[PDB]
mmCIF file of C-alpha atoms in Angstrom:
data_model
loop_
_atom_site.group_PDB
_atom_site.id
_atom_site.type_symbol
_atom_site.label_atom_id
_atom_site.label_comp_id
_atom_site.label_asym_id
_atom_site.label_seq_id
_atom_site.Cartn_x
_atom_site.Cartn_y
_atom_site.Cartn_z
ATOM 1 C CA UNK D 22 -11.064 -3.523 12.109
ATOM 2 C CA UNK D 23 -10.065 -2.488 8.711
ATOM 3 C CA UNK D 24 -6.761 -0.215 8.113
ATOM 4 C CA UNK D 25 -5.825 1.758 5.065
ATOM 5 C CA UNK D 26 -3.188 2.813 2.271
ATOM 6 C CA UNK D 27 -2.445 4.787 -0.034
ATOM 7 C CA UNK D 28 0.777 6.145 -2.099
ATOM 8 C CA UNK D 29 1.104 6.920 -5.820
ATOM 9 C CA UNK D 30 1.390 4.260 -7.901
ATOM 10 C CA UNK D 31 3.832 5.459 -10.260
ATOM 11 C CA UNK D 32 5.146 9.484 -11.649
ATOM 12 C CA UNK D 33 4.133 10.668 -14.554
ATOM 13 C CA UNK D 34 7.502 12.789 -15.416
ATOM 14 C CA UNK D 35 9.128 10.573 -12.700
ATOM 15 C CA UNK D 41 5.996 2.211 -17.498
ATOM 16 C CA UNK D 42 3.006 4.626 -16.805
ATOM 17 C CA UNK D 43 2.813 7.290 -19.320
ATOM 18 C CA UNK D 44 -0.954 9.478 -19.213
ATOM 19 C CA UNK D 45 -1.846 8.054 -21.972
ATOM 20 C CA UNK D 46 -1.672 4.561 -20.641
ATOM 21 C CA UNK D 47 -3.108 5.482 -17.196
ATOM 22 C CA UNK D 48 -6.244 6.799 -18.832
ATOM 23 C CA UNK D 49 -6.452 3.953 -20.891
ATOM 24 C CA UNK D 50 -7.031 1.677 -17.719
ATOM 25 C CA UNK D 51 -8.852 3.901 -15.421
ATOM 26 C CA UNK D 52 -11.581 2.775 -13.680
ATOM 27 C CA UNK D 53 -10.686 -0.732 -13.346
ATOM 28 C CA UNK D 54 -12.732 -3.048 -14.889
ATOM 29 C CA UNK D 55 -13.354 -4.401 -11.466
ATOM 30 C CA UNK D 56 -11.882 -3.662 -7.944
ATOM 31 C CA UNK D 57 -8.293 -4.833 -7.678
ATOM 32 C CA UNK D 58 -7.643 -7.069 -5.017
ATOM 33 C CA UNK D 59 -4.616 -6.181 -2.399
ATOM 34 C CA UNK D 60 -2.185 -9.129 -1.680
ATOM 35 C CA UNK D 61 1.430 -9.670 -0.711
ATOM 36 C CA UNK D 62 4.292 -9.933 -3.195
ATOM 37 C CA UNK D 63 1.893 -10.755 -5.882
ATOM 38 C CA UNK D 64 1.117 -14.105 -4.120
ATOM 39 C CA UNK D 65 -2.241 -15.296 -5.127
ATOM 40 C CA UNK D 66 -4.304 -17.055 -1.967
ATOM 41 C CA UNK D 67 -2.992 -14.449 -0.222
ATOM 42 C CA UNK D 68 -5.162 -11.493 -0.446
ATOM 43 C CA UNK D 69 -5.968 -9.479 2.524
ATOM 44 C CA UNK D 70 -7.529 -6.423 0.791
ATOM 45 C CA UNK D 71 -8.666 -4.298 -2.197
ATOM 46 C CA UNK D 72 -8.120 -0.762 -3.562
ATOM 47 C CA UNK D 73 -11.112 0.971 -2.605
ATOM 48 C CA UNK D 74 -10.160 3.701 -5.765
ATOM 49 C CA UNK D 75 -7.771 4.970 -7.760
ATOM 50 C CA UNK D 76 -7.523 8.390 -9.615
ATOM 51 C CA UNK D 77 -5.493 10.021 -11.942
ATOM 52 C CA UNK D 78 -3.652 13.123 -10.322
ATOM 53 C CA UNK D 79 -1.692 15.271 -12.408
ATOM 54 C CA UNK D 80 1.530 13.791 -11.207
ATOM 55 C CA UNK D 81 0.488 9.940 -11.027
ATOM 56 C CA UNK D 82 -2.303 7.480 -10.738
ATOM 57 C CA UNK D 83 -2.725 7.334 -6.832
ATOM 58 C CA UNK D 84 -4.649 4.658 -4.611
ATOM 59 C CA UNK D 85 -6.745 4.509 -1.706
ATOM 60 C CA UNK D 86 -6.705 0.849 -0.396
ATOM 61 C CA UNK D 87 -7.743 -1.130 2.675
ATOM 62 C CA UNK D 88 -6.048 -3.645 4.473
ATOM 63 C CA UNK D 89 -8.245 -6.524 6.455
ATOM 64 C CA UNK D 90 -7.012 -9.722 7.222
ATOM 65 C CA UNK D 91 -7.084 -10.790 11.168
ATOM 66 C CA UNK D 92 -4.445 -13.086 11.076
ATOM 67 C CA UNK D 93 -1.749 -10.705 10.155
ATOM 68 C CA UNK D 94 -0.998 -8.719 12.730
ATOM 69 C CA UNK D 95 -0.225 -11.718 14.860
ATOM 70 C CA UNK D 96 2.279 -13.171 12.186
ATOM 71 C CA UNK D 97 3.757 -9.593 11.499
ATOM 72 C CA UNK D 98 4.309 -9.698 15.282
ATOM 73 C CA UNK D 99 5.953 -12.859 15.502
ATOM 74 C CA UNK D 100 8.159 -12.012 12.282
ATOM 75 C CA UNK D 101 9.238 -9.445 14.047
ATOM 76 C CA UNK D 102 9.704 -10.943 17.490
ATOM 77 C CA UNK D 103 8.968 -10.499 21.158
ATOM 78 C CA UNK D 104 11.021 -7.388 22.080
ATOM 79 C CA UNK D 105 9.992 -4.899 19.726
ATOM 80 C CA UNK D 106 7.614 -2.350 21.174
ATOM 81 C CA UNK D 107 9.152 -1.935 24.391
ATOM 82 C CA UNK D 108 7.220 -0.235 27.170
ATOM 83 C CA UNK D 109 5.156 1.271 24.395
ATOM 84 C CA UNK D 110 1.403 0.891 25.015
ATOM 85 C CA UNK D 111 -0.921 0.423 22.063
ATOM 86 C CA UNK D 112 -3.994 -1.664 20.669
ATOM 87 C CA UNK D 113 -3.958 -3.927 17.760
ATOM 88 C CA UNK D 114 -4.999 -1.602 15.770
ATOM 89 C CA UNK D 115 -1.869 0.791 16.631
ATOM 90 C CA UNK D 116 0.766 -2.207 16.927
ATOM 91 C CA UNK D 117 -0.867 -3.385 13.396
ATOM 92 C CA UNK D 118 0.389 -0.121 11.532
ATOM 93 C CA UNK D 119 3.599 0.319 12.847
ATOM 94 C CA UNK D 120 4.148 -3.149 11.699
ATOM 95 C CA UNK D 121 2.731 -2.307 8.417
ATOM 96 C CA UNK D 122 4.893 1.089 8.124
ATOM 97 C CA UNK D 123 8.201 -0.952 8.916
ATOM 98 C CA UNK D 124 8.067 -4.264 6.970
ATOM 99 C CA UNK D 125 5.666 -3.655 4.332
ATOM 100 C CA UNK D 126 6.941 -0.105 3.227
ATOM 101 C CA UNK D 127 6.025 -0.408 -0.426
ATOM 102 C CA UNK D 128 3.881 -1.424 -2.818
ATOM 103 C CA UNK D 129 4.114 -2.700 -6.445
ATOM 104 C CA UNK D 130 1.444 -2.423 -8.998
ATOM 105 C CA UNK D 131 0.526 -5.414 -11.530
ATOM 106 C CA UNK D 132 0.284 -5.122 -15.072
ATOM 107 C CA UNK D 133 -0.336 -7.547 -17.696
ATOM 108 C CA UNK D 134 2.250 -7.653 -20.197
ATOM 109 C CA UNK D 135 0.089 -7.037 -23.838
ATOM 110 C CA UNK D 136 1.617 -8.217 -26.745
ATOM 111 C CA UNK D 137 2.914 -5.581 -29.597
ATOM 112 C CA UNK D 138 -0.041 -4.460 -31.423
ATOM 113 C CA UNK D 139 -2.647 -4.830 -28.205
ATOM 114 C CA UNK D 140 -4.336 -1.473 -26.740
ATOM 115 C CA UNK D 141 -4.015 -0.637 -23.346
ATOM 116 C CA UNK D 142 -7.760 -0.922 -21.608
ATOM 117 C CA UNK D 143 -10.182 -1.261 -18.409
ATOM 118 C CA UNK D 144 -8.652 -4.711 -17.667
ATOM 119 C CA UNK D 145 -4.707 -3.934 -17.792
ATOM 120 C CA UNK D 146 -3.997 -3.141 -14.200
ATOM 121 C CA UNK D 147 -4.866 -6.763 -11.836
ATOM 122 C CA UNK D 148 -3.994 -6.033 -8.430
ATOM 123 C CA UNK D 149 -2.037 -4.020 -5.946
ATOM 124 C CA UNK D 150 1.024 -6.060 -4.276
ATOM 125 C CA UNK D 151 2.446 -5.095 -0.224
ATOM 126 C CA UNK D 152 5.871 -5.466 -0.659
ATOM 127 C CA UNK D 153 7.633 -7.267 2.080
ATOM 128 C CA UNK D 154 11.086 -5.101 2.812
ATOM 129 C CA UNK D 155 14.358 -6.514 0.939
ATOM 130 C CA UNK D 156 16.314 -6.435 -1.984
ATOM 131 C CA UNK D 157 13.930 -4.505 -4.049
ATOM 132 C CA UNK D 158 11.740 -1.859 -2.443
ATOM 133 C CA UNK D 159 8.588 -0.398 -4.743
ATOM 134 C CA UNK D 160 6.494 2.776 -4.463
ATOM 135 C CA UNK D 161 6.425 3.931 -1.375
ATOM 136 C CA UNK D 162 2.560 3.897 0.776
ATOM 137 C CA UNK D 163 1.508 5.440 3.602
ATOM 138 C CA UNK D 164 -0.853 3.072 6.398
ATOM 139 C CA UNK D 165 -3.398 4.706 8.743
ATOM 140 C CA UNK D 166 -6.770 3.696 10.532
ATOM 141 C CA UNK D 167 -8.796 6.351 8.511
ATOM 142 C CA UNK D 168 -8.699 7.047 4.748
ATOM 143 C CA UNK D 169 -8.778 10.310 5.296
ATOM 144 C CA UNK D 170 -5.329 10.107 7.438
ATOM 145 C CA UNK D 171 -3.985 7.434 5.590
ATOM 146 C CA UNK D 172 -3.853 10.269 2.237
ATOM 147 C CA UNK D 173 -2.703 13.582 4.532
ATOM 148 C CA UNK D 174 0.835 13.140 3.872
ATOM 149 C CA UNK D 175 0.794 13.454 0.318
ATOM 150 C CA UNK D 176 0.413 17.247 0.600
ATOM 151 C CA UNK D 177 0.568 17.278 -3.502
ATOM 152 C CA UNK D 178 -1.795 15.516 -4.026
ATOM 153 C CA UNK D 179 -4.201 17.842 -5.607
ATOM 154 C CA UNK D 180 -7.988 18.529 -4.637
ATOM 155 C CA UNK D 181 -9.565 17.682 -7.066
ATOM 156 C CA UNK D 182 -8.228 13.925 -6.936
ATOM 157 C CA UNK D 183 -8.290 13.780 -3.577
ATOM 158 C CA UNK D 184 -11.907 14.417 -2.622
ATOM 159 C CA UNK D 185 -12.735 12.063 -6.402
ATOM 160 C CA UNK D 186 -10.765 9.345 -4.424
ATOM 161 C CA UNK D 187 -12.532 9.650 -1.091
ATOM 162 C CA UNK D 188 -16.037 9.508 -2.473
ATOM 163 C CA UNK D 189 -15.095 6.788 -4.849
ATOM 164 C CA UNK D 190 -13.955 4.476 -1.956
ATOM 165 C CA UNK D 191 -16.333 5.640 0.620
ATOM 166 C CA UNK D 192 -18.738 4.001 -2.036
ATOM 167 C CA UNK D 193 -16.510 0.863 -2.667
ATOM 168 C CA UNK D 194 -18.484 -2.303 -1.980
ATOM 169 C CA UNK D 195 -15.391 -3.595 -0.626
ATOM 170 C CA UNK D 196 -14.759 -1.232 2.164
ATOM 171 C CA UNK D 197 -16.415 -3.718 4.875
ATOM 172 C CA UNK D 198 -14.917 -7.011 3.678
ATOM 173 C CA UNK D 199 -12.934 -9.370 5.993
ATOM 174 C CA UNK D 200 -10.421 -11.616 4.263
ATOM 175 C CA UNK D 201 -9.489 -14.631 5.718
ATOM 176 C CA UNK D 202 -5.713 -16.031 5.922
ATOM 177 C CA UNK D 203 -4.333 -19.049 7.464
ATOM 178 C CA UNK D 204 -1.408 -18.417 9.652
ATOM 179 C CA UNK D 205 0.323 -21.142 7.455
ATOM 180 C CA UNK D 206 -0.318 -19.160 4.545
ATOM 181 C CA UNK D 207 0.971 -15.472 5.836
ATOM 182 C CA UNK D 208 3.806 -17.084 7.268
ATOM 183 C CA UNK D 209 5.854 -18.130 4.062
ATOM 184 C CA UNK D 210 4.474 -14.607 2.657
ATOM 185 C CA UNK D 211 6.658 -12.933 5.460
ATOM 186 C CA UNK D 212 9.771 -14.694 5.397
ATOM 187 C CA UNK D 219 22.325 -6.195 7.556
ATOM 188 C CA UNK D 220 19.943 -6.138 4.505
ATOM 189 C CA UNK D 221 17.457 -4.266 6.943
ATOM 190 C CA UNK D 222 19.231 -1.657 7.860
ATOM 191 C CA UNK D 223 20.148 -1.167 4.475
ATOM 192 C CA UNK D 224 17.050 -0.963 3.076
ATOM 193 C CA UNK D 225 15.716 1.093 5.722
ATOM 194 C CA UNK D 226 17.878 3.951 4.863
ATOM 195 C CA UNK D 227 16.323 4.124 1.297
ATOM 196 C CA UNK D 228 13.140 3.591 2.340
ATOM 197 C CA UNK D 229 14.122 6.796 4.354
ATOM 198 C CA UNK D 230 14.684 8.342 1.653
ATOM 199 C CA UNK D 231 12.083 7.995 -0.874
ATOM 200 C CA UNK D 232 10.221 8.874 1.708
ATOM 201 C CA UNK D 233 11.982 12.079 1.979
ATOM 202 C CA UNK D 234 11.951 12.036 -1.743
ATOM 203 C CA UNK D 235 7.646 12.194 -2.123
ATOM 204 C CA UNK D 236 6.989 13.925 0.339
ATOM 205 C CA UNK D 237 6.113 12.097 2.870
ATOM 206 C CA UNK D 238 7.119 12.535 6.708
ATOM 207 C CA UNK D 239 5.373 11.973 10.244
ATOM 208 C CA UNK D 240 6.542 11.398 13.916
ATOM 209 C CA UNK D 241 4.114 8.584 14.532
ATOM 210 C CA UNK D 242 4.320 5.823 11.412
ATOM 211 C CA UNK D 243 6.349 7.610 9.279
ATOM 212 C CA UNK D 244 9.621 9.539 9.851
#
């Protein structure tokens, strides 16, 4: 079954300025969800976006069946421990540790073009390394999967659930081979985990169960 995301895509006072943000909002169609920016290697769409006062934030949802078992295997056999869990469970954990960010795509316009529907293209997982983007939050509801961002105000919030609970994408499947999601996922841990940590900790953003 289908698991979801969400984070802000960028901080207005912190590219993004409000001006910009309403220039591209809605999309001009859905934005597909992929990792690293790889093309044939989509495994879901943002169900919405809205423009909160302090950034344009997404709900998204992740659906590809093939990833959890790759994720699993990047990770290798000793990871979970005596921890029970379904696929579902093992799937976010996996999510929350190795695909911590997210990185939106813009098109570069030329000088003299005007910002419009068409500008933002699609919403890249970010596969933990040298460079770590705007931190997301994973869950197996939308409604969890947005709790954490306590600043989120109310006004975008509910605007973002009725949007995507209306998203023609919200029951898609995509389809990856295992060749394909493995060269997607292929000290420098550690490292990055501690700043990971802390944008975390920066945003707002802290749990017991995914998060920290």
């Amino acid at each position: 079954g289908p698991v979801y995301v969400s984070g802000y895509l960028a901080l207005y006072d912190r590219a993004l300025t409000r001006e910009i943000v309403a220039a591209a909002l809605p999309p001009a169609g859905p934005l597909p969800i992929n990792i690293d920016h790889r093309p044939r290697c989509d495994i879901g769409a943002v169900l919405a976006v809205v423009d909160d006062d302090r950034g344009p934030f997404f709900l998204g949802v992740v659906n590809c069946p093939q990833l959890g078992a790759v994720l699993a295997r990047a990770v290798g056999p000793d990871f979970f421990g005596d921890m029970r869990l379904s696929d579902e469970e093992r799937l976010l954990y996996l999510l929350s540790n190795y695909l911590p960010s997210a990185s939106l795509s813009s098109r570069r316009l030329a000088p003299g073009e005007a910002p419009d529907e068409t500008l933002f293209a699609h919403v890249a997982l970010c596969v933990i390394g040298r460079r770590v983007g705007t931190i997301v939050v994973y869950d197996a509801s939308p409604e969890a999967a947005v709790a954490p961002f306590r600043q989120l105000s109310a006004r975008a919030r509910s605007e973002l659930l009725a949007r995507a609970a209306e998203s023609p994408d919200r029951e898609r499947v995509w389809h990856m081979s295992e060749e394909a999601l493995t060269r997607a996922l292929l000290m420098l841990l550690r490292d990055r985990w501690e700043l990971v940590a802390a944008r975390r900790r920066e945003a707002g953003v802290r749990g017991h169960t995914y998060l920290q």
